[PDB]
Amino acid sequence: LLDAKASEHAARMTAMKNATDNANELIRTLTLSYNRARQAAITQEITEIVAGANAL
Amino acid sequence: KGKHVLVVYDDLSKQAAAYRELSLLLRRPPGREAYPGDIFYLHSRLLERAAKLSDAKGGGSLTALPFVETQAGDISAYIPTNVISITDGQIFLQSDLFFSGVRPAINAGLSVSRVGGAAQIKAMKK
Amino acid sequence: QVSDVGTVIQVGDGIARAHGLDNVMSGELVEFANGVMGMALNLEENNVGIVILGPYTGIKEGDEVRRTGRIMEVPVGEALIGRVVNPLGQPVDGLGPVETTETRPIESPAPGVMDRRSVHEPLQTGIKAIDALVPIGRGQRELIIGDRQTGKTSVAIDTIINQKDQNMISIYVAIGQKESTVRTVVETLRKHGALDYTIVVTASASQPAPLLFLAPYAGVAMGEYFMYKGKHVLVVYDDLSKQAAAYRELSLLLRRPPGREAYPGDIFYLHSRLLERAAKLSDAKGGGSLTALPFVETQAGDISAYIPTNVISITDGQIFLQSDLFFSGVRPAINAGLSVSRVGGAAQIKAMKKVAGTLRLDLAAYRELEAFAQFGSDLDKATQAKLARGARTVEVLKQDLHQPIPVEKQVLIIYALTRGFLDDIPVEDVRRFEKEFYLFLDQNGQHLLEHIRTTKDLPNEDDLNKAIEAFKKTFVVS
Amino acid sequence: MTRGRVIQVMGPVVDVKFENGHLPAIYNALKIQHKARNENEVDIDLTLEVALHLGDDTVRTIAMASTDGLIRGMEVIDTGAPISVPVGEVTLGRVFNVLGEPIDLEGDIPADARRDPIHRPAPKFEELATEVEILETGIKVVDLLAPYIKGGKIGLFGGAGVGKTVLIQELIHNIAQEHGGISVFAGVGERTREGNDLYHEMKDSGVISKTAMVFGQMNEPPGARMRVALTGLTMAEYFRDEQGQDVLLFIDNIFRFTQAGSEVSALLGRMPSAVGYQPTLATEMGQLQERITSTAKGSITSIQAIYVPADDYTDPAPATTFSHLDATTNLERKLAEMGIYPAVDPLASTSRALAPEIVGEEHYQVARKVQQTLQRYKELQDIIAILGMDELSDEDKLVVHRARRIQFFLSQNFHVAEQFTGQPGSYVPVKETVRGFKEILEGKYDHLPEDAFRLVGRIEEVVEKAKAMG
Amino acid sequence: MTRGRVIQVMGPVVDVKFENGHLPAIYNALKIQHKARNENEVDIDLTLEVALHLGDDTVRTIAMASTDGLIRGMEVIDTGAPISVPVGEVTLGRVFNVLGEPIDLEGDIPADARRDPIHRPAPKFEELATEVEILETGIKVVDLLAPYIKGGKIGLFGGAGVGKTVLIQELIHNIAQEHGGISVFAGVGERTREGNDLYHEMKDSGVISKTAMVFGQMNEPPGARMRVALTGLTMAEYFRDEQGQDVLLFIDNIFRFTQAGSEVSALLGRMPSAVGYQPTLATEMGQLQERITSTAKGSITSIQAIYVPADDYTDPAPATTFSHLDATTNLERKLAEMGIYPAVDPLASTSR
C-alpha cells in the first residue's frame, strides 16, 4: 500500500507536468492566431476607411 | 380588409447583398463591409409593416417569417445581428442536429419567443 | 509642336505621366532625356502613364520622352553566359559590354496544350535527401518554401553547382537580395567553376520596385531562347514573395483597389503567367525543357498565408524546410509530411527507385516514433530496431556545404543503409564511414560505378554485398 | 458604317469611339485586324467584348487576349453579335479555346457550321422540370449515399492524385454507355500540364470520341478565364435542347471564374466589395449557374471542382458558390492508400436527395443503417488501439466485422481500370446495390472472407470471388 | 529662376509654385528666410524637402520644422542640391540636428567646410568586397558565440537598465583603440532626456572624443525624424571612403524610422500598405541599409536596436528589418540581476 501511494503521487507529478506543457504549447499557437487576426482586422479596417474616403 | 396574412421571406441576406450591389453600382459611399449606411433601415422598413391591427382598423393581422442564412453558424455577423435586433424572437437551426436525422433541428436553448404565453392556448400553455 | 515625342507632366514615387506620344504602343519602351528607360502602361485620352525603370531623381517635369519602337525586350544570346546583368540586360559586373544580337519580348505566350509532353528525365540536384525522397523532373515546377535563414540559397547554389557535366544551362535570379550576398554567391560560383554555364540576373533591394517586378520575367525570357533552341535550362527565382511585395507597392502607388492582405487581385495572374512558361516541350516542338525552382519566404511557417497558398496552387509540388533543426547545423530537415513531388517519381532512375520506397518507410516509422516512444526502458520490441535504423537514416541524410554527391554514390550508400549493413556500426561514426566508403568505391568499385552510370540500374546484389563486406572488414570503428 | 477607333488602352480594358447612332449593344464582339505599316508597329489580330456604354458614343470593352502593341486611333470593326461558337457533332473529340477555334492539330472548322451566341437568357419558369429525377450513375457509393440529381450541381472536393481524373473518366464513360449522353469538359484556369495529361489519358482510354474540350488555363487573360465556362456551357446547351439527351458538364475550377471577374471589375472601374471582389458577384455567378437546369427534353448536370483562397471557407466567392450546389463528394487519401478505388469518402459525402421522399423509404433506411454502422466503426477505432481488440463486446466485434465487409464492398472495378488490371469492370444498378447492402446488413455473408468484396459489382460477384478464394 | 512662391500650406505639407522651366529636382532642399515686414507677421527660418512634381509648375514638399506663420506668396529660394551636411574631422565630438547645424554650445561650423549630399546611390557591384571578414571586437561573448561581420548589420535587443549604453560605449572604445576607426551615433526618435543623459555619460567616459552624434527628437516633424538616419549614414560614409577606415554606426531605434516613413506617406496621401504602413516600406529600408556595406578600401558596420510592436515578430516592420540582419545579440535581465556583465544571453544570441 505504501509503494502504491508513492506510485500514485509520482503519476500525479507526471500528469500535472504534462498538462502544463500542453497548456503552454496551446498558448503559443493561440498567440500566433491572435496576431494573424489582429493584422487582418487592422488591414480590413484601414482598407474600408480609405475606400470610403476615396469614394468622394 | 380584416383578413389574416402570413408572409415568408425566403432569404433576407440575398436581398441585402443585392442592395449592396445596387448601391455600389450607383457609386454611393460604402460603410462597414462595403454595405451602405441604410442597410438597417432597409430591413426595418420591411419588417415594421407586420402588425396586429386594432379593433377600430378592422382587426386584421400580418405575420412574417423572414429567413437569414449564416456562414458556419456565425450568429454574430452584421446582417444576422441587424435582423435579430429588429424581429421579436428567433428560431435557430443546427447543422449538426440536422445531420443526425433530427428534423427539424431546433435549438431550444438559443431559440426565444418574445410574445410567449399570449400566443398559446390554455392547454398548451399549462 | 509635333506631338510624336512626349513631354513629362507629373513625376512622383517612380511613376511618370507624359503628354504627347500619339503613336506610342502599349507596352513599348520609352527613353527619357536623362538616358533612363521606361515602360508605358496606360494610354489615356490625352496623356500616357510611364513606369520608370531606373533612378527617377534626375527626371524633372518638362523633360523630353522619346519612343523606341520596341515592345519590352531583353538581349539574349550565347555571350550572356557567365555575366551578371540587371533585368534590362545591362552588365553590372563590368568586364566590358555584352555582344548579343537577338532579343525576346518580356511578355510571351506560354507553350500550348498540344506542345507539351510528360516529363521523364531526372534532374540530379546532388543532395541525398532531395534526390531520394522528393525527385525533380526536367520540366517540373517545384517550389522550395520555408522561413527565413533556412539555407534556401545554399540549396540553390548546391543544385546549380551539381550541373557541371550535365550540359544544362542554369540561371540564378536574385530578387531583393543584398548586394554583398549576391557578390559572395557569384564569388563561390566562380570558385567552383559554375560560371562556364550559368547566368546571374540581379535586382537588389535598393533598386526601384519596377526592376524587382521585372527581374523574373527577364530571367525566364533568357531561358526561353535556349529552351526553344533544343537545350535544357534551369532557372531559380530567389523570392517571389519579394517580387509580389514590389508589385503590391506599384499597384498601391497606381491607386488601385487592394484585396486580401492589401495585395491586388492580379497577384495570382502575376505568378501564374510566370510559372506557366516552364514546360517540357514535345519532340515535335524540339524536345527542349525548362525547369523552375521558385523560393517563398514564410513567417513562422505559416502555410496559410496568401502568397504561399497561391504559389502552392500553381507549382507541381513543394519542398518544405524547417527552421527547428537548422540550429543543429544539419541542412534543414525536409518535412516528410509537407514535401511531395506529384510530377516526380517517374523521373527517378531505376537504381534509386528500387530503394526510395523502403527508405521512405523507415524514415516515416522513425518520425512517427516520437519522443513519447523514446521514454522508459520497456521498448523491447522491434521498435528499438526501428529507432536505431531511423537514427541511422537521419545521420546519413546529413550533408556538408557545397559538396554535391553523385547519384551512383547516393544509390550505393542508401542501399548499404537499407540492407542492414550499418545496423551495427555506431551513429557517431556514420559520416566517416560514408566518406571512407566513397573513397573505397572510387578505388575499387569502379566497375560498379560504371555499370550504374551506364545502365541506370543496380549491379548484382551478391556482388555489391561482397564489396560492402570487404569495405567493412577494411574499416575500423572508433 | 458601324466602324470605330481606339481612344484609350489600359491593361485588358480598351475604349472605342463610334459614329453616333451606331453603338454596338452590350456583349457584342469587336474585331481588330491590323497590319504593321513600318518597323515601329506590330501586327495585331484581337477580339473584344463590349461591357459598358460610357456616354459620348464611347464603348468600354474587355480584351480576349494580350493588348500589347495597340496604338490609339486603330480601326475597330464590329461583328453585330456576341461571341459565336460552333456547335453540333463537329465539336466531339476536339479541343477549343475561348473563341471556339480548334486548339488541336486536327484542322479547322468549315465556315458554314452553325454557331451560337455565348450569352443567352436563362430558361423560363414554365419549361423547367416539375419533379426531381435521380440520375443513376452506376457507381455504388455515389448512387447509395450521395445520389446525383438531373439538373443539379455537384461539388467535387479532394486534392490531386486521389482519383479525381479516374472518377471523371468513369462517369463520362458510364453516362455515354447507359444514357447515350455526351460530356463537356471546361478547363477554367488550371495547369496546362494537368490539361495535357488529362487529354492524353482520355485519348488513350478511348473516351474522347464522345466529349468536347475547352481550355482556359492559368496563363490566359481574365476575359478568356471568364468566358471559357460560358462557351463550354453553350456547347452543352445545344445537345440538351436539340438531341433531347442528358449531358454532363465538368468545370475544372469555378473559383478561377470569380477570381477573373474580380480582376476585371477593378480595371472596369467599379467600386470594390467586402474583400475587394466585384459588386456583381452574386448576379454574375447566378447568371452562369442558372443555365444548368433540367427541362422537359433532357437535362444538364454539372460536376464542379472548388478551390478556397487561404483555406477560408467564409470567403465571399465560396460562400456564393456553395448556395447553388446540391450534393458534395469528398475524396480521401486514407481510402486511396487503403486501396479501395471509388476513392470517395462515404461519411463526408452528402446529398440534398438523401431523403425517403425522393429515393424511397427502403433506400433511405439502408443508407441510414450503413451510415450508422460506419460511424460506430469510426468511433470504435479509438478503443480498437487504446484497449486493443480486448474488452470489446460481442456487438462491437460483430459491428467491426460488418463494417469491414461494408467498407470492402463499397469499392468497385471501373471500365477505365481495365487497361491496367485486365478485369473489365461492371455497371451496378441502384436497386442491385440496395439489395446487396440489405443482404450484407442482414448478415447473410458474415462467413465470407472480407477480401472477396474488393473490386466487384453485384452481390453475386462476391460469392464467385469467395468460391475462387476457397 | 531661383525664386518660388508658396501657394498652399496644409499642416506640415507645403506646396511651392516656381516659374516654368526651372523646377528643382526631387529631394532638393528649399530654404525659406523671411523678416517681419510689420507687426502682423513673424520671422520664419524653415527648410523644405521636395517630394513630388504635381504638374502645373507646382512642387509638393515636406517641412523640417514648424510651419506656423507661413503666408501664401512668400519667396522660396532653391539650393540646387539635396541637404548638405558637414563631413570630416570637425564633426568629431559634436552634436548635430538633421540639417547639419550644430546643437551643442561649442560654436558653429565655418561655412567653407566640405558638405556632402544626403541622398546618394548605393555603392555599385564592383566596389563591394568579395569575401566575408570578421570584425574582432575584443569582447569574449561576441567574439565567441555571435561574431560580427565587417559591413554587417547587428540587431540589439533589450530594455533599459540592462547595459545597452555600457555595451555601446565599450564597443566604441575598443574599436577606436584597436582599429583606429571612429563611430557615429544616430538617435532616431529618441527621448530628449535619455539622449542628454547618454551624451553626458559619453562625455564623462571620454568616448566622445572620437565619435559624432546626430539627434532627431520626438517633437521634430516626420521629415526630420526620417532623414536623421540618412544624415548619420552620410556622415559615416566620408570616413568609409576618404580615410579608408572601418566605422561603427549606431541607430537608436529603426522602428521609429519606419513609423516616421509611414506618417510622411500618410501625409502625402498614398494608399496604405498591409497594416497601414507606407507602400514603399521595403524600398525605403533597402535604400537605407544597402549603403551600409564593405568596400575594397573600407567598411561600415552597424549596431541597430529594434523594438517589436506588440511582441509580434511577424509584424511587417520587424519582418522587413530582419531580412537584412547578419547577427543578433540579446540582453538578459536575469544575467543583469546575476553578477555577470555585459549580461549578453549566450543562447538567445545568434550569428550567420
Short mmCIF file of C-alpha atoms in Angstrom, two decimals, chain C residues 20-28 41-48 67-71 107 109-118 141 256-260 265-269 272-273 276 304-306 309-310 312-316 340 342-343, chain D residues 7-11 37 39-42 66-72 95 103-105 160-161 189-193 195-197 199-200 215 217-222 225 256 259 262-263 266-267 270 272 275-277 307 309-312 315-316 333:
data_model
loop_
_atom_site.label_atom_id
_atom_site.label_comp_id
_atom_site.label_asym_id
_atom_site.label_seq_id
_atom_site.Cartn_x
_atom_site.Cartn_y
_atom_site.Cartn_z
CA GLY C 20 2.15 63.58 -76.39
CA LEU C 21 3.46 60.31 -77.85
CA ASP C 22 0.49 59.93 -80.16
CA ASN C 23 1.88 56.88 -81.98
CA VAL C 24 3.22 55.02 -78.94
CA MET C 25 2.06 51.43 -78.47
CA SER C 26 1.02 49.84 -75.19
CA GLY C 27 3.95 48.07 -73.58
CA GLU C 28 6.57 50.00 -75.55
CA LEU C 41 1.26 51.04 -69.27
CA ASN C 42 -1.79 53.27 -69.76
CA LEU C 43 -2.75 55.13 -72.93
CA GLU C 44 -5.25 57.65 -71.59
CA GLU C 45 -7.25 60.03 -73.76
CA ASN C 46 -4.65 62.82 -73.53
CA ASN C 47 -1.56 61.53 -71.70
CA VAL C 48 0.46 58.34 -71.26
CA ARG C 67 9.89 56.49 -78.45
CA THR C 68 11.99 53.42 -79.18
CA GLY C 69 9.59 51.41 -81.35
CA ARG C 70 10.28 48.17 -79.47
CA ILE C 71 7.99 46.25 -77.15
CA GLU C 107 5.50 39.16 -72.28
CA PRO C 109 2.71 33.28 -74.65
CA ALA C 110 3.30 30.01 -72.85
CA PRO C 111 3.53 26.70 -74.75
CA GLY C 112 0.12 25.34 -75.64
CA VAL C 113 -1.59 22.16 -74.53
CA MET C 114 -0.60 20.25 -77.66
CA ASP C 115 3.00 21.49 -77.47
CA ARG C 116 3.83 19.98 -74.07
CA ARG C 117 4.81 16.43 -73.15
CA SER C 118 5.03 14.44 -69.92
CA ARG C 141 7.88 23.36 -61.35
CA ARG C 256 -5.66 50.53 -57.45
CA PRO C 257 -8.07 48.84 -55.01
CA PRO C 258 -6.31 46.22 -52.89
CA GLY C 259 -7.65 42.87 -51.76
CA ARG C 260 -6.65 40.37 -49.08
CA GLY C 265 -6.35 40.81 -57.16
CA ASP C 266 -3.92 40.44 -60.07
CA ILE C 267 -1.18 38.78 -57.99
CA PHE C 268 -2.29 35.25 -58.89
CA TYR C 269 -2.19 36.17 -62.58
CA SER C 272 0.80 32.10 -62.98
CA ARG C 273 1.90 33.99 -66.10
CA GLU C 276 3.33 28.64 -66.69
CA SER C 304 -1.99 29.63 -44.68
CA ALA C 305 -0.57 32.93 -45.94
CA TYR C 306 -1.88 34.33 -49.22
CA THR C 309 -1.11 29.35 -50.88
CA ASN C 310 -1.13 30.98 -54.32
CA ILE C 312 1.44 26.15 -53.92
CA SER C 313 -1.70 26.17 -56.08
CA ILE C 314 0.46 26.73 -59.17
CA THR C 315 3.53 24.52 -58.78
CA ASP C 316 3.58 20.75 -59.15
CA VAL C 340 5.65 15.99 -52.14
CA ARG C 342 3.43 14.66 -57.70
CA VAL C 343 5.12 15.01 -61.10
CA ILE D 7 -9.18 56.18 -77.90
CA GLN D 8 -7.93 54.55 -74.69
CA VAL D 9 -5.87 51.46 -73.88
CA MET D 10 -5.16 50.46 -70.28
CA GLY D 11 -4.37 46.87 -69.39
CA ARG D 37 2.81 49.97 -91.61
CA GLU D 39 9.19 48.67 -88.46
CA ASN D 40 7.77 50.58 -85.46
CA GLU D 41 4.49 48.63 -85.44
CA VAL D 42 3.37 45.06 -84.83
CA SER D 66 -2.96 40.42 -74.86
CA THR D 67 -3.23 44.12 -75.69
CA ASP D 68 0.47 44.67 -76.40
CA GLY D 69 1.17 46.76 -79.47
CA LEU D 70 -2.17 48.58 -79.51
CA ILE D 71 -1.98 52.20 -80.69
CA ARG D 72 -4.54 54.93 -80.11
CA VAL D 95 -10.21 20.89 -78.12
CA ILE D 103 -6.51 24.18 -80.50
CA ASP D 104 -5.51 20.65 -81.53
CA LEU D 105 -3.80 19.81 -84.82
CA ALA D 160 -4.55 15.95 -56.80
CA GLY D 161 -3.65 12.31 -57.28
CA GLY D 189 -7.86 28.40 -65.11
CA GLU D 190 -5.79 25.36 -64.14
CA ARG D 191 -2.43 23.83 -65.01
CA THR D 192 -1.61 23.30 -68.68
CA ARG D 193 0.40 20.23 -67.69
CA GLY D 195 -4.80 19.62 -69.01
CA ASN D 196 -2.43 17.86 -71.39
CA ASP D 197 -2.17 14.85 -69.08
CA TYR D 199 -6.23 14.93 -72.68
CA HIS D 200 -3.74 12.11 -73.24
CA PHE D 215 -9.32 25.07 -72.09
CA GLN D 217 -5.70 27.56 -68.37
CA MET D 218 -4.00 29.94 -65.96
CA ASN D 219 -1.81 31.84 -68.43
CA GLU D 220 -4.83 33.21 -70.32
CA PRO D 221 -6.13 36.75 -69.69
CA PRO D 222 -9.13 37.38 -67.41
CA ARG D 225 -10.72 32.89 -67.94
CA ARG D 256 -10.92 30.92 -61.17
CA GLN D 259 -11.29 35.46 -59.49
CA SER D 262 -12.83 40.27 -59.64
CA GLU D 263 -9.65 41.04 -61.58
CA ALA D 266 -11.27 46.74 -60.93
CA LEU D 267 -10.00 47.50 -64.43
CA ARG D 270 -16.41 49.68 -60.39
CA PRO D 272 -14.95 47.25 -54.77
CA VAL D 275 -12.99 41.68 -49.81
CA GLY D 276 -12.26 43.62 -52.99
CA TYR D 277 -14.45 41.40 -55.17
CA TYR D 307 -10.95 25.94 -54.52
CA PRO D 309 -8.35 31.04 -51.07
CA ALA D 310 -6.12 30.83 -47.99
CA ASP D 311 -8.34 27.96 -46.77
CA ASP D 312 -11.05 30.45 -45.77
CA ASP D 315 -14.75 33.90 -48.21
CA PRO D 316 -17.42 35.57 -50.39
CA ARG D 333 -6.19 9.97 -49.32
#
